[PDB]
Amino acid sequence: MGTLGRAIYTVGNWIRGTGQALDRVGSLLQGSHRIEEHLSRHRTLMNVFDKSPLVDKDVFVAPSASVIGDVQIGKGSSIWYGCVLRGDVNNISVGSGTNIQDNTLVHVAKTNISGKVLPTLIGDNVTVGHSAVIHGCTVEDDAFVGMGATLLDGVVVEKHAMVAAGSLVKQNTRIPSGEVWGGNPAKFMRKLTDEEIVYISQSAKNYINLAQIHASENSKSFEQIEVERALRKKYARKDEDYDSMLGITRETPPELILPDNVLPG
Amino acid sequence: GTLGRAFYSVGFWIRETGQALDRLGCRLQGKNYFREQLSRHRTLMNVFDKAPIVDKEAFVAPSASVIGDVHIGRGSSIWYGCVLRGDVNTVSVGSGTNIQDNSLVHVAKSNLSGKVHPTIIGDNVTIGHSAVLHGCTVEDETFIGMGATLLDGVVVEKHGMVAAGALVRQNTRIPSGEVWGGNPARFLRKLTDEEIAFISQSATNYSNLAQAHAAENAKPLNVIEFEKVLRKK
């Protein structure tokens, strides 16, 4: 503080001005070709056509996800990195405890080619795998859509049904309960064992638990990010021998400890 | 050229030095705001002098990636999560064409498998959600099904349709008014006139939808969200 504080602050101002002027000169020498990085204009939640997404309290939405228009997401659900839920021409409804995994597209249609156009309905405790594409179809509760799979308009995935990873489910196809379909075009493969039904439920619950740690991390402020970066560096290695010489026991701070429900055991 | 590249390199040295000086000045004032991890994503990214040329009436979603020599025409639209990378060669998109969410339109990364083919997208073309176009030409008024992949050398003649989830092998030509689908892509049937009408009307409806999304994205950033993020505890 004080006079020395003020003098150093003023000298820092001069140095900053010089630095920014040098940056401008360097930009001029580049021929102005480099496009400047700007503040982020991506909006995680957006209105369109006076439609606002209705998202529950306990929903993980990755900052990189796009939730647009008339979207409803229920309790315990999770929208992961790169997901796009565009409800601009119709409604998208997501039940409770349902995960929509990375890079997935969910869209609707205003008017399909033939037949009654329907919104996109995804029920409770549904798992949708990475980079799936859901378009104007219905997924009922406790169903499983595999990663890379594609559901076209009018598709109904019934309760306790599975769509295999990478499948192309043609328009108006109905996957009945207890079966798994797959291939291109998607067709019946075999019945679902009870162990797989338990697997589906476990997948939904595990993703509910994963969403918590991801949501906690993504919502931290700049100060807390800095605090935890310093702590992480502090506790990255150890010298328990020198600690025993000092007679102390270094303990991992709780902000670096994950909950047991996400640990492999 | 080479002289431009040398000036670009020397320019980066002057910039590196200036930004280092600015950080010194902020450190003397006890500021650490430069340590904040902010996204360096650029909607339009240049690779030296290969920059994207985008028409003023073309909607580009902010989260989309347009890298290198990419041309987007009037009334066209690049939706959320799309990636267009023309660096080893060029990528051109015609007018009134919609490239839907999470689509990838790129050229071959290396010339190891021969000369790198550019990607040409015609006019009033529809490219479905999460489709992969790799060094292919797609003529005017064609329909690329969502989730479909087009490999290098492919030509989709005007009024051609590629079914959803199809895999069009390398150097395949899709004739006009034909619907091809499956892996590998094979002729399914002929295109009907109602579907041609749907092609054109869908390209028009998406141009109007692109306009609506462009107005909601150009709305000024809300200060209240900024203050809420800033004052978190």
Partner: peptide, 29 residues
């Protein structure tokens, strides 16, 4: 308006003193 960290300010003064002193040391030898 003012830099608060006193130890940082004293370190800055020490660094400046070292630089000016090295310059004087060359200039007078």
């Amino acid at each position: 308006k003012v830099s608060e960290d006193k130890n940082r300010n004293y370190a800055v003064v020490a660094g400046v003193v070292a630089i000016v002193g090295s310059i004087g040391w060359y200039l007078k030898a």
